[PDB]
Amino acid sequence: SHMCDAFVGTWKLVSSENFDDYMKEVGVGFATRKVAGMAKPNMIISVNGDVITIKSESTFKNTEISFILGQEFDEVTADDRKVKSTITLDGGVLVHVQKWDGKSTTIKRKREDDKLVVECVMKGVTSTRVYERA
Numbered sequence: 001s002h003m004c005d006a007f008v009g010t011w012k013l014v015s016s017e018n019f020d021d022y023m024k025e026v027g028v029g030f031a032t033r034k035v036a037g038m039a040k041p042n043m044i045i046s047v048n049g050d051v052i053t054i055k056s057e058s059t060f061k062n063t064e065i066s067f068i069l070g071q072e073f074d075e076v077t078a079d080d081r082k083v084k085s086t087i088t089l090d091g092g093v094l095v096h097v098q099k100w101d102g103k104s105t106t107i108k109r110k111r112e113d114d115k116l117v118v119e120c121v122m123k124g125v126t127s128t129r130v131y132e133r134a
């Protein structure tokens with residue numbers, strides 16, 4: 001109880017850096033990169049007992065995942081990858097690992113001041129996305 005309190009709420013994207021290069025590293029094709037890169041998603045995070053839900057709404061795609069920390073689940077990503085995901089809490093940071101096709105990417109979500117900072121890493125390439133409260 002109270003594990004992710006500081007994440008819960010409704011958040012809006014305010015900045016993005018290096019996302020196109022991250023998507024390239026992931027394997028995302030041209031047209032999806034262009035439309036996905038334009039998106040300005042809202043992220044809605046909620047907790048009910050042990051179940052965390054992260055919803056993302058944008059003009060590109062609406063997605064929703066619900067999960068228990070440490071417990072793998074199957075996810076279809078906005079770019080239509082079919083991945084095996086595991087999300088854990090490590091020192092206050094939500095760490096989301098996605099596995100598919102012998103590949104892996106990690107998404108870390110952290111509270112920093114009034115922001116929620118999202119770092120997406122694929123091999124040597126990092127993208128940083130900053131969300132503020134809606």
Ligand SMILES: C[C@@](CCOc1ccc(Cl)c(F)c1)(C(=O)O)c1ccc(Cl)c(Cl)c1
Pocket residue numbers: 013023026028036037039041043056057058060061077078079107118120129
């Ligand atoms: C980056 C992220 C979360 C992960 O999401 C990914 C990741 C890869 C790919 Cl290829 C993709 F399309 C989405 C965010 O927290 O900002 C996001 C959310 C929602 C949207 Cl709509 C977009 Cl574009 C990006």
